[PDB]
Amino acid sequence: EFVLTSVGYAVGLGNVWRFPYLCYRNGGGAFMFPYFIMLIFCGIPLFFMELSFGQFASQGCLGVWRISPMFKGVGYGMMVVSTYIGIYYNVVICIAFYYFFSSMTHVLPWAYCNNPWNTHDCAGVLDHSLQRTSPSEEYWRLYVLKLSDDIGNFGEVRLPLLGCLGVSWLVVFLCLIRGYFTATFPYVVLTILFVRGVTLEGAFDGIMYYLTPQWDKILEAKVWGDAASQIFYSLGCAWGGLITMASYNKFHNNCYRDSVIISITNCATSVYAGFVIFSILGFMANHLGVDVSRVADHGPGLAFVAYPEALTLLPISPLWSLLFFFMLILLGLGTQFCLLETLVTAIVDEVGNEWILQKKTYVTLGVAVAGFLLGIPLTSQAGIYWLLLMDNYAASFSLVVISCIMCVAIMYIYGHRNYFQDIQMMLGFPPPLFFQICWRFVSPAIIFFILVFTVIQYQPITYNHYQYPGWAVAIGFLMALSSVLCIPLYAMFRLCRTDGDTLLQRLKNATKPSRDWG
Numbered sequence: 085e086f087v088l089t090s091v092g093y094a095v096g097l098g099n100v101w102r103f104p105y106l107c108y109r110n111g112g113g114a115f116m117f118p119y120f121i122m123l124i125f126c127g128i129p130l131f132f133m134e135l136s137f138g139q140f141a142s143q144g145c146l147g148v149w150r151i152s153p154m155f156k157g158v159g160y161g162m163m164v165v166s167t168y169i170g171i172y173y174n175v176v177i178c179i180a181f182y183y184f185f186s187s188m189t190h191v192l193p194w195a196y197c198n199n200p201w202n203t204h205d206c207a208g209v210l211d212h213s214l215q216r217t218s219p220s221e222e223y224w225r226l227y228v229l230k231l232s233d234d235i236g237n238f239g240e241v242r243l244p245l246l247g248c249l250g251v252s253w254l255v256v257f258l259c260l261i262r263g264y265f266t267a268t269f270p271y272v273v274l275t276i277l278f279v280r281g282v283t284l285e286g287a288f289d290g291i292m293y294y295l296t297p298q299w300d301k302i303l304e305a306k307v308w309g310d311a312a313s314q315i316f317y318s319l320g321c322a323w324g325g326l327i328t329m330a331s332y333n334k335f336h337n338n339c340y341r342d343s344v345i346i347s348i349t350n351c352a353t354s355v356y357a358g359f360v361i362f363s364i365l366g367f368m369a370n371h372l373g374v375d376v377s378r379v380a381d382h383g384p385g386l387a388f389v390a391y392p393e394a395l396t397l398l399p400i401s402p403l404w405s406l407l408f409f410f411m412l413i414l415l416g417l418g419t420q421f422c423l424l425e426t427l428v429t430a431i432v433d434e435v436g437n438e439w440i441l442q443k444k445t446y447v448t449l450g451v452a453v454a455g456f457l458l459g460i461p462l463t464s465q466a467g468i469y470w471l472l473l474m475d476n477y478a479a480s481f482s483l484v485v486i487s488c489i490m491c492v493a494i495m496y497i498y499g500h501r502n503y504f505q506d507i508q509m510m511l512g513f514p515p516p517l518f519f520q521i522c523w524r525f526v527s528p529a530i531i532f533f534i535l536v537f538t539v540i541q542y543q544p545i546t547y548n549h550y551q552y553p554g555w556a557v558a559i560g561f562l563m564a565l566s567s568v569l570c571i572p573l574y575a576m577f578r579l580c581r582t583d584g585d586t587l588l589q590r591l592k593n594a595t596k597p598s599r600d601w602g
């Protein structure tokens with residue numbers, strides 16, 4: 085039953101919710117081909133490299149950087165990325181909590197729009213007018229989240245969402261002191277949703293659009309940069325917990341097969357989620373009158389505008405809605421629990437002897453209470469504006485760069501021959517020929533090419549799919565740089581303390597693997 089265990093290791097909210105909206109924003113058909121190219125060459129070998137690095141020396145996200153102590157800032161940068169996804173991941177779960185709790189009525193609220201909080205922009209299937217909105221979209225954009233016209237419009241804090249955030253954080257916190265249905269449940273619900281949709285009118289037009297590619301946007305750096313964003317965010321690379329949970333693996337394990345299987349099931353689940361989502365989008369375009377490419381607003385909420393519509397059409401809809409949103413909550417809670425456990429362990433490990441080690445529960449409460457206070461702005465009226473900016477800036481591309489430096493920290497600093505000999509001690513065979521060439525040359529250079537295009541050469545004002553004010557993009561750029569500046573700054577700190585005068589010969593000393601390594 086190893087496949088079942090590997091199936092539930094990779095499935096989370098990073099592909100059920102993030103992948104559909106990312107694909108729709110990037111065009112769908114023009115995103116899968118870059119996604120498929122990115123997954124095979126840079127993201128499958130990086131996953132294996134991270135797994136092997138964690139498995140060889142049993143150490144957490146940091147502390148394992150004795151292969152090159154000067155680059156210990158890479159591990160610190162990983163926790164900064166993990167922290168950023170630790171304060172807005174819950175808000176995704178909290179919206180699921182609001183949707184889960186609101187489905188207990190006789191009928192789902194997002195079924196008929198004869199409600200006080202709608203305008204005359206409704207089409208309806210169970211029921212002057214231009215660009216009609218789906219009944220589920222208005223219930224989301226006007227009741228679940230009272231939207232504002234700009235980021236600087238906090239206004240009134242949404243009380244029910246604040247309560248849901250408190251409940252979710254308390255549930256996560258109480259699941260840390262105390263310690264089927266986890267890998268087959270998401271697939272059953274996704275299959276049930278797949279039987280629906282594809283049998284509805286106009287669904288095929290929204291299916292090909294998800295598949296057929298356009299040879300016009302495959303050259304732009306935005307699509308390739310975002311494809312690496314999803315292939316890394318939804319795979320756990322550079323998150324920080326990939327190495328930490330790999331530390332508990334045995335020495336003579338088979339990390340190659342584990343990595344291959346986990347990546348394959350993750351990609352298959354992401355493709356299945358996209359296939360289910362785009363089935364509904366075609367039906368929405370057919371019944372609304374607009375085309376598929378303009379039927380849903382490009383933004384963080386697409387799993388809450390497309391999925392709820394599908395569940396409505398099913399017989400005895402409230403039970404199916406409860407099951408689906410409970411599945412989403414379970415996946416989000418599992419991923420958040422893993423992330424918080426890894427962060428708490430990494431923080432706790434490198435502190436003083438006893439006064440901040442035996443009282444691990446208190447520091448866990450402090451971490452679990454810092455996220456709640458930091459998550460209050462995300463639950464306000466201008467909530468998804470901040471979450472989307474945090475998603476698209478903080479944990480969008482840094483995960484690539486932080487990993488890319490890793491791919492250079494061992495192959496061209498530690499020594500690729502030394503690392504290749506190191507894996508041969510783990511297994512009965514040396515690393516496969518595909519991973520040897522891809523690690524050294526094919527993968528990192530590709531990242532650098534994006535770093536050549538998406539940074540300086542090809543960054544017009546068009547690189548903002550939305551229209552944020554100057555302060556918003558400034559804070560987003562600072563957040564993006566906050567998780568990457570930890571690598572050169574820690575190197576400078578090491579160079580300021582290392583013993584020596586030339587500091588060129590000592591640069592070898594500061595990068596030579598430590599005696600603790602092995």
Ligand SMILES: CN(CC[C@@H](Oc1ccc(-c2ccccc2)cc1)c1ccc(F)cc1)CC(=O)O
Binds near residue numbers: 098166321333419
């Ligand atoms: C897709 N999610 C990643 C889930 C998980 O990824 C795994 C990685 C590795 C192993 C594993 C464990 C033991 C042995 C072998 C492999 C399991 C799961 C992870 C969670 C938090 C992190 F910080 C990093 C990774 C994130 C999302 O939901 O977007």
